Amino acid sequence: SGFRKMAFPSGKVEGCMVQVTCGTTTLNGLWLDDVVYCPRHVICTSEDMLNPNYEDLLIRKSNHNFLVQAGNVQLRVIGHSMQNCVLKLKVDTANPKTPKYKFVRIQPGQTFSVLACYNGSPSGVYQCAMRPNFTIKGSFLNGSCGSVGFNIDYDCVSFCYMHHMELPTGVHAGTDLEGNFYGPFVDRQTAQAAGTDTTITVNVLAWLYAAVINGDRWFLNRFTTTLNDFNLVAMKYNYEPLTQDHVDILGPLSAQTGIAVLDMCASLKELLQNGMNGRTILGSALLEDEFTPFDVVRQCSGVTF
Amino acid sequence: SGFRKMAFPSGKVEGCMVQVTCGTTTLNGLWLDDVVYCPRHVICTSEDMLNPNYEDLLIRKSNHNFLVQAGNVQLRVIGHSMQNCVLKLKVDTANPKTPKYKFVRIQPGQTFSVLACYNGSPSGVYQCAMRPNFTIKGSFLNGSCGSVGFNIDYDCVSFCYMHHMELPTGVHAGTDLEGNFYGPFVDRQTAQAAGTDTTITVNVLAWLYAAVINGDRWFLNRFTTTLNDFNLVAMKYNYEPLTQDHVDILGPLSAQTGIAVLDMCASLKELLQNGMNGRTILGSALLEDEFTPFDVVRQCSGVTF
């Protein structure tokens, strides 16, 4: 019983964090096999950050300009190359703690675990969600650049996020491990703003199902709704539209609880129109939208109350 | 910037989880050096759980009755002994991944990281707090027994919690690594209830300071309060009394923000009497009480907005 923001164990990823330095610019890197991945921003000097031409700055660099430190052990760079916004540094030693891994790109609404890292040493782990506007509401301080996000699926680490920068609104932006940014952002020290954000409807419903499985039911009702009438209410409250396919993914949760998806939508509509009135759901006074259907199954018993 | 429930990286603890089996009872264990720690409840058969005499059941057991599995590697037990509610199994191999560690007991209101484990393999990590009634509001399923809580302080793992059981209210109870339970609970499969819970006042104020450091200030006011007048309001709302020493620990946060502790108390009193009115603090519509002053410093910049 219980429900909490849960991150994957970070052990398999801890053994891959390294420190990467170019001149006086320093940040975190990810050492897998004999390659080190890190943001290409590391090759910028302070005066290059405002408006860099990266492939003009990279030709001007040599291997011995890159200092890679795994703990106290210095790694020697034997080759470099640029892949979009990610710099790939070929080293002489294959990381002995390299786990099975893939490079995956996540969709808006999906979640992942984040290993906050400073100077190559991890400091914390927590769960995050990719917002519909392609930012994340993480917790990052100066020097966190290079930190990575990931999911774990039977020993295999799916890396999906590399942290790059903070935005004026206090949200964070980054790329996948291929160097392709999430959203309409770039690697330049100019002020960039995120688009307007929305609420992940399917995630809300999954969280409501989690509540039912954990014994809460006050928000349920006897009313029913159609998919479209719900969407007309959701749009007025800045909720993402619900697709008929979004309903199918909620099938397993609907069957284990015996509550039709559109019946759970009826409760969501009423919650949107009357608030919660000081009442709470799973210890929260807001509707939580950072738990996917998969997170709910991963945590909740297979048997309802 | 940002604020999130953050757990310590679990890598150093992952390398110590093992599976312990006695007869058909199975649960998680902690392998440090050549000793394996686990709940003594593992030596109970189904019919012994309702009312066991543990030192009567332990004399009836021999070393070869205990199967210890670290992954697929079986460990051979060369000695056993009971320390309060914790069973200590001496094995022949010293764990090569044994980190520097201490055994510490935490106080009500302190936080720790929890590594949820099933059959000796970790499945998740998250942050928890010890409630004033000595329970924790964790996320645990059947088989999580033996999971451990911990803090990490410069390479050294301070183990502080070993999970034992779930209560009828859905909260969780356990012991320190010495086998001494937290709160008035025992290891018997009988229904036990937790005392009434309270809100950790000092933690609330620390969370309010975290908000100020991250740019939020709408809840601040110009009013001032004395320590006692606040306590008279807090008692009516089931808040823990604030001691003059509790104020001193909030000193660093008060100085970095320039807000007198009793001024922050004035805001708390008004928040208690008028609610939040649909407004949020750090993305929460409730007053959060699971962040200590130390957690706030660990996460927030040393420079306020």
Ligand SMILES: COc1cncc(-n2c(=O)[nH]/c(=N\c3cc4cn(C)nc4cc3Cl)n(Cc3cc(Cl)c(F)cc3Oc3ccc(F)cc3)c2=O)c1
């Ligand atoms: C606490 O809040 C934070 C949370 N998370 C991350 C950060 N954070 C950093 O930690 N370091 C940043 N720059 C660096 C400065 C350095 C000085 N040294 C010696 N080494 C360095 C390495 C880096 Cl990377 N930056 C800005 C940034 C990083 C990158 Cl990759 C980039 F491509 C552009 C860019 O400029 C922008 C871009 C957009 C924007 F809206 C504002 C500034 C940044 O935001 C701060």
Ligand SMILES: COc1cncc(-n2c(=O)[nH]/c(=N\c3cc4cn(C)nc4cc3Cl)n(Cc3cc(Cl)c(F)cc3Oc3ccc(F)cc3)c2=O)c1
């Ligand atoms: C999902 O919710 C949960 C979240 N976290 C933990 C649990 N959870 C377990 O996972 N296993 C439990 N028993 C076991 C059964 C087993 C069958 N096999 C083959 N192996 C076994 C090993 C154990 Cl340990 N128990 C009860 C419990 C464990 C211990 Cl140590 C104890 F000392 C007494 C006791 O009985 C009580 C005590 C108080 C109470 F209010 C209710 C029952 C338990 O609560 C459930």
